[PDB]
Amino acid sequence: EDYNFVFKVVLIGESGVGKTNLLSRFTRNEFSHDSRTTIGVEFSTRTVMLGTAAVKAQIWDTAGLERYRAITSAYYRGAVGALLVFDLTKHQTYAVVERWLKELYDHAEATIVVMLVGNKSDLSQAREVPTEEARMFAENNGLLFLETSALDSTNVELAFETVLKEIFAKVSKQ
Ligand SMILES: Nc1nc2c(ncn2[C@@H]2O[C@H](COP(=O)(O)OP(=O)(O)O)[C@@H](O)[C@H]2O)c(=O)[nH]1
Ligand SMILES: [Mg+2]
């Protein structure tokens, strides 16, 4: 229980993109295919060293994020980070990224650090979203960017640590 900050980081994007498995990989180094999940919303935690600061990352996840729900407001409330995940082998999951941003900014504060994540990079042979295209989008929209694989661990820790360093930088100036 050595930590100085608690950072709430929510995972968002279409179902099937890998959000639950980015959580499990980062927090438990685990990867399932059909994940046992509780009803509604959950989080898992991981303490991370940022230089000499101890930060407790609170990673939030759910299966039904969906604007009609009463719970959406509470889900986003107090979030200082977000990973907006798409499946790089499914163009459709990336085509709705703008819509997810809008949903996110209706409920999160503008200071939230957002990373656009292209997941399933181990399947880059079957890619439908050029890295360059996704990268420019993120730059035009004030989003950090990375491609990850929750399956092969590529960039998962880096994804989370980059968001967390950006949050810490930011909140130090608040
Ligand atoms: N090849 C590959 N499959 C993945 C990856 N991440 C998740 N999956 C699979 O995609 C499916 C959905 O992933 P899940 O974590 O439940 O996504 P969620 O619906 O966004 O929470 C499951 O079969 C996962 O095992 C990845 O990085 N690579
Ligand atoms: Mg899930």
mmCIF file of C-alpha atoms and ligand atoms in Angstrom:
data_model
loop_
_atom_site.group_PDB
_atom_site.id
_atom_site.type_symbol
_atom_site.label_atom_id
_atom_site.label_comp_id
_atom_site.label_asym_id
_atom_site.label_seq_id
_atom_site.Cartn_x
_atom_site.Cartn_y
_atom_site.Cartn_z
ATOM 1 C CA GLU A 1 0.000 0.000 0.000
ATOM 2 C CA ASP A 2 2.885 2.393 -0.856
ATOM 3 C CA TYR A 3 1.390 5.037 -3.180
ATOM 4 C CA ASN A 4 1.099 8.815 -3.370
ATOM 5 C CA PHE A 5 -1.485 9.224 -6.163
ATOM 6 C CA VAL A 6 -4.480 7.152 -7.223
ATOM 7 C CA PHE A 7 -5.172 7.548 -10.975
ATOM 8 C CA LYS A 8 -8.527 6.377 -12.343
ATOM 9 C CA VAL A 9 -8.013 5.229 -15.974
ATOM 10 C CA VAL A 10 -11.053 3.946 -17.904
ATOM 11 C CA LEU A 11 -10.996 1.586 -20.880
ATOM 12 C CA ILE A 12 -13.311 2.362 -23.801
ATOM 13 C CA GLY A 13 -13.971 1.253 -27.409
ATOM 14 C CA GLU A 14 -16.074 -1.440 -29.182
ATOM 15 C CA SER A 15 -16.566 -4.876 -27.715
ATOM 16 C CA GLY A 16 -14.039 -7.483 -28.815
ATOM 17 C CA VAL A 17 -11.175 -5.043 -29.203
ATOM 18 C CA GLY A 18 -9.195 -6.328 -26.163
ATOM 19 C CA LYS A 19 -10.014 -3.916 -23.343
ATOM 20 C CA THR A 20 -10.517 -6.585 -20.637
ATOM 21 C CA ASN A 21 -7.331 -8.329 -21.724
ATOM 22 C CA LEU A 22 -5.270 -5.112 -21.688
ATOM 23 C CA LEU A 23 -6.471 -4.723 -18.106
ATOM 24 C CA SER A 24 -5.609 -8.331 -17.145
ATOM 25 C CA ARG A 25 -2.312 -8.239 -18.912
ATOM 26 C CA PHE A 26 -1.232 -4.987 -17.258
ATOM 27 C CA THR A 27 -2.553 -5.676 -13.749
ATOM 28 C CA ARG A 28 -2.091 -9.496 -13.497
ATOM 29 C CA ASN A 29 0.047 -10.436 -16.527
ATOM 30 C CA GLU A 30 -2.859 -12.676 -17.519
ATOM 31 C CA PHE A 31 -4.533 -13.283 -20.932
ATOM 32 C CA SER A 32 -7.838 -15.198 -21.341
ATOM 33 C CA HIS A 33 -10.144 -15.671 -24.392
ATOM 34 C CA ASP A 34 -13.517 -15.754 -22.606
ATOM 35 C CA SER A 35 -12.906 -13.669 -19.506
ATOM 36 C CA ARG A 36 -14.795 -14.325 -16.257
ATOM 37 C CA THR A 37 -16.197 -10.890 -15.469
ATOM 38 C CA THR A 38 -18.633 -9.685 -12.748
ATOM 39 C CA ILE A 39 -21.922 -7.908 -13.630
ATOM 40 C CA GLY A 40 -21.528 -4.244 -14.604
ATOM 41 C CA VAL A 41 -18.369 -2.321 -13.849
ATOM 42 C CA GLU A 42 -15.107 -3.342 -12.296
ATOM 43 C CA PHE A 43 -11.549 -2.211 -11.766
ATOM 44 C CA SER A 44 -8.162 -3.709 -11.017
ATOM 45 C CA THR A 45 -5.179 -1.900 -9.596
ATOM 46 C CA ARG A 46 -1.472 -1.773 -10.134
ATOM 47 C CA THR A 47 1.152 0.379 -8.361
ATOM 48 C CA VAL A 48 3.806 1.771 -10.695
ATOM 49 C CA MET A 49 7.082 3.620 -10.014
ATOM 50 C CA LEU A 50 7.345 6.923 -11.946
ATOM 51 C CA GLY A 51 10.918 7.912 -11.140
ATOM 52 C CA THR A 52 10.612 8.040 -7.346
ATOM 53 C CA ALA A 53 6.810 8.618 -7.225
ATOM 54 C CA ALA A 54 4.580 5.644 -6.458
ATOM 55 C CA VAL A 55 1.334 5.800 -8.431
ATOM 56 C CA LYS A 56 -1.569 3.408 -7.915
ATOM 57 C CA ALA A 57 -3.198 2.948 -11.341
ATOM 58 C CA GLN A 58 -6.925 2.086 -11.065
ATOM 59 C CA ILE A 59 -7.919 0.435 -14.315
ATOM 60 C CA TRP A 60 -11.673 0.525 -14.959
ATOM 61 C CA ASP A 61 -13.522 -1.814 -17.292
ATOM 62 C CA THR A 62 -17.033 -2.882 -18.198
ATOM 63 C CA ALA A 63 -18.888 -4.775 -20.991
ATOM 64 C CA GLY A 64 -21.824 -2.495 -21.510
ATOM 65 C CA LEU A 65 -20.654 1.019 -22.046
ATOM 66 C CA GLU A 66 -23.641 2.405 -23.929
ATOM 67 C CA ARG A 67 -24.945 5.992 -23.808
ATOM 68 C CA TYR A 68 -28.498 5.047 -22.634
ATOM 69 C CA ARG A 69 -27.195 3.533 -19.401
ATOM 70 C CA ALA A 70 -27.622 5.306 -16.083
ATOM 71 C CA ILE A 71 -24.186 4.108 -15.075
ATOM 72 C CA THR A 72 -22.133 5.856 -17.766
ATOM 73 C CA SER A 73 -21.752 9.119 -15.837
ATOM 74 C CA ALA A 74 -20.401 7.282 -12.726
ATOM 75 C CA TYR A 75 -18.137 5.162 -14.916
ATOM 76 C CA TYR A 76 -16.314 8.236 -16.317
ATOM 77 C CA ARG A 77 -16.543 10.316 -13.131
ATOM 78 C CA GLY A 78 -13.127 11.247 -11.774
ATOM 79 C CA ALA A 79 -11.244 9.570 -14.634
ATOM 80 C CA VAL A 80 -7.851 11.211 -15.257
ATOM 81 C CA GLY A 81 -6.841 8.776 -18.039
ATOM 82 C CA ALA A 82 -8.464 6.790 -20.824
ATOM 83 C CA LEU A 83 -7.361 4.174 -23.301
ATOM 84 C CA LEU A 84 -9.572 4.330 -26.352
ATOM 85 C CA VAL A 85 -8.976 0.916 -27.801
ATOM 86 C CA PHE A 86 -9.651 -0.341 -31.320
ATOM 87 C CA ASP A 87 -8.880 -3.708 -33.041
ATOM 88 C CA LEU A 88 -6.361 -2.860 -35.817
ATOM 89 C CA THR A 89 -7.644 -5.881 -37.863
ATOM 90 C CA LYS A 90 -11.222 -4.483 -37.827
ATOM 91 C CA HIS A 91 -11.685 -1.086 -39.567
ATOM 92 C CA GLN A 92 -15.195 -0.679 -38.053
ATOM 93 C CA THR A 93 -13.806 -0.509 -34.467
ATOM 94 C CA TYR A 94 -11.611 2.411 -35.577
ATOM 95 C CA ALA A 95 -14.322 4.113 -37.709
ATOM 96 C CA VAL A 96 -16.304 4.900 -34.503
ATOM 97 C CA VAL A 97 -13.322 6.409 -32.608
ATOM 98 C CA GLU A 98 -14.661 10.018 -33.086
ATOM 99 C CA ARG A 99 -17.995 8.961 -31.656
ATOM 100 C CA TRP A 100 -16.252 7.452 -28.587
ATOM 101 C CA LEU A 101 -14.331 10.687 -28.026
ATOM 102 C CA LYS A 102 -17.542 12.665 -28.089
ATOM 103 C CA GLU A 103 -19.124 10.220 -25.606
ATOM 104 C CA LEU A 104 -16.021 10.481 -23.439
ATOM 105 C CA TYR A 105 -15.931 14.298 -23.408
ATOM 106 C CA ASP A 106 -19.666 14.454 -22.516
ATOM 107 C CA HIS A 107 -18.701 12.889 -19.141
ATOM 108 C CA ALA A 108 -15.026 13.240 -18.512
ATOM 109 C CA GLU A 109 -13.099 16.451 -17.833
ATOM 110 C CA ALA A 110 -11.113 17.932 -20.698
ATOM 111 C CA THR A 111 -7.798 17.406 -18.800
ATOM 112 C CA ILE A 112 -8.247 13.575 -19.099
ATOM 113 C CA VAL A 113 -5.224 11.992 -20.799
ATOM 114 C CA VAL A 114 -6.436 9.867 -23.725
ATOM 115 C CA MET A 115 -4.385 7.270 -25.565
ATOM 116 C CA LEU A 116 -5.652 5.820 -28.796
ATOM 117 C CA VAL A 117 -4.639 2.134 -28.724
ATOM 118 C CA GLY A 118 -4.502 -0.129 -31.789
ATOM 119 C CA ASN A 119 -4.716 -3.556 -30.243
ATOM 120 C CA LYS A 120 -4.101 -7.071 -31.666
ATOM 121 C CA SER A 121 -0.783 -6.088 -33.281
ATOM 122 C CA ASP A 122 0.275 -9.789 -33.245
ATOM 123 C CA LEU A 123 -2.246 -10.058 -36.118
ATOM 124 C CA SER A 124 -0.728 -7.142 -38.116
ATOM 125 C CA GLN A 125 -0.777 -9.508 -41.141
ATOM 126 C CA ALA A 126 -4.576 -9.044 -41.098
ATOM 127 C CA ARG A 127 -4.392 -5.231 -40.479
ATOM 128 C CA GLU A 128 -7.170 -2.947 -41.736
ATOM 129 C CA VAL A 129 -6.084 0.325 -40.097
ATOM 130 C CA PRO A 130 -2.744 1.725 -41.310
ATOM 131 C CA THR A 131 -0.606 2.772 -38.349
ATOM 132 C CA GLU A 132 0.171 6.131 -40.068
ATOM 133 C CA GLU A 133 -3.549 6.970 -40.455
ATOM 134 C CA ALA A 134 -4.340 6.186 -36.802
ATOM 135 C CA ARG A 135 -1.231 8.172 -35.675
ATOM 136 C CA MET A 136 -2.186 11.360 -37.578
ATOM 137 C CA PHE A 137 -5.724 11.084 -36.204
ATOM 138 C CA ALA A 138 -4.349 10.935 -32.633
ATOM 139 C CA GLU A 139 -2.061 13.938 -33.270
ATOM 140 C CA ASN A 140 -4.945 15.946 -34.787
ATOM 141 C CA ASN A 141 -7.051 15.143 -31.718
ATOM 142 C CA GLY A 142 -4.709 15.590 -28.769
ATOM 143 C CA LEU A 143 -4.438 11.843 -28.146
ATOM 144 C CA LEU A 144 -1.373 9.775 -27.399
ATOM 145 C CA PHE A 145 -0.992 6.749 -29.667
ATOM 146 C CA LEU A 146 0.355 3.195 -29.577
ATOM 147 C CA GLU A 147 -0.295 -0.222 -31.043
ATOM 148 C CA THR A 148 -0.306 -3.050 -28.533
ATOM 149 C CA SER A 149 -0.855 -6.785 -28.303
ATOM 150 C CA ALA A 150 -2.513 -7.966 -25.100
ATOM 151 C CA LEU A 151 -1.769 -11.515 -26.370
ATOM 152 C CA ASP A 152 1.994 -11.076 -26.911
ATOM 153 C CA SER A 153 2.459 -8.198 -24.275
ATOM 154 C CA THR A 154 3.932 -5.851 -26.914
ATOM 155 C CA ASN A 155 3.643 -2.245 -25.585
ATOM 156 C CA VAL A 156 1.092 -3.028 -22.904
ATOM 157 C CA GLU A 157 3.139 -1.821 -19.985
ATOM 158 C CA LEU A 158 4.367 1.066 -22.100
ATOM 159 C CA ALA A 159 0.798 2.025 -23.061
ATOM 160 C CA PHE A 160 -0.240 2.270 -19.387
ATOM 161 C CA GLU A 161 2.994 3.857 -18.153
ATOM 162 C CA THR A 162 2.897 6.582 -20.833
ATOM 163 C CA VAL A 163 -0.655 7.554 -19.862
ATOM 164 C CA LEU A 164 0.273 7.535 -16.179
ATOM 165 C CA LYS A 165 3.398 9.714 -16.698
ATOM 166 C CA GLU A 166 1.346 12.182 -18.696
ATOM 167 C CA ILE A 167 -1.337 12.341 -15.948
ATOM 168 C CA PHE A 168 1.352 12.822 -13.256
ATOM 169 C CA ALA A 169 3.037 15.594 -15.272
ATOM 170 C CA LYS A 170 -0.392 17.215 -15.690
ATOM 171 C CA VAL A 171 -1.669 16.923 -12.079
ATOM 172 C CA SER A 172 1.666 18.283 -10.720
ATOM 173 C CA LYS A 173 0.773 21.590 -12.427
ATOM 174 C CA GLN A 174 -2.809 21.677 -11.102
HETATM 175 N N1 LIG B 1 -4.752 -12.007 -31.216
HETATM 176 C C1 LIG B 1 -5.199 -11.218 -30.207
HETATM 177 N N2 LIG B 1 -6.401 -11.469 -29.640
HETATM 178 C C2 LIG B 1 -6.825 -10.672 -28.616
HETATM 179 C C3 LIG B 1 -5.979 -9.562 -28.144
HETATM 180 N N3 LIG B 1 -6.630 -8.946 -27.153
HETATM 181 C C4 LIG B 1 -7.811 -9.606 -26.991
HETATM 182 N N4 LIG B 1 -7.918 -10.634 -27.869
HETATM 183 C C5 LIG B 1 -9.063 -11.547 -28.004
HETATM 184 O O1 LIG B 1 -10.187 -10.820 -28.507
HETATM 185 C C6 LIG B 1 -11.377 -11.293 -27.877
HETATM 186 C C7 LIG B 1 -12.000 -10.140 -27.099
HETATM 187 O O2 LIG B 1 -11.069 -9.573 -26.182
HETATM 188 P P1 LIG B 1 -11.570 -8.880 -24.813
HETATM 189 O O3 LIG B 1 -10.403 -8.589 -23.923
HETATM 190 O O4 LIG B 1 -12.706 -9.641 -24.141
HETATM 191 O O5 LIG B 1 -12.127 -7.512 -25.450
HETATM 192 P P2 LIG B 1 -13.233 -6.506 -24.884
HETATM 193 O O6 LIG B 1 -14.596 -6.969 -25.362
HETATM 194 O O7 LIG B 1 -12.912 -5.176 -25.528
HETATM 195 O O8 LIG B 1 -13.198 -6.367 -23.385
HETATM 196 C C8 LIG B 1 -10.932 -12.486 -27.026
HETATM 197 O O9 LIG B 1 -10.853 -13.611 -27.916
HETATM 198 C C9 LIG B 1 -9.525 -12.107 -26.683
HETATM 199 O O10 LIG B 1 -8.728 -13.226 -26.356
HETATM 200 C C10 LIG B 1 -4.704 -9.365 -28.800
HETATM 201 O O11 LIG B 1 -3.924 -8.437 -28.454
HETATM 202 N N5 LIG B 1 -4.393 -10.219 -29.789
HETATM 203 MG MG MG B 2 -14.452 -6.703 -21.915
#
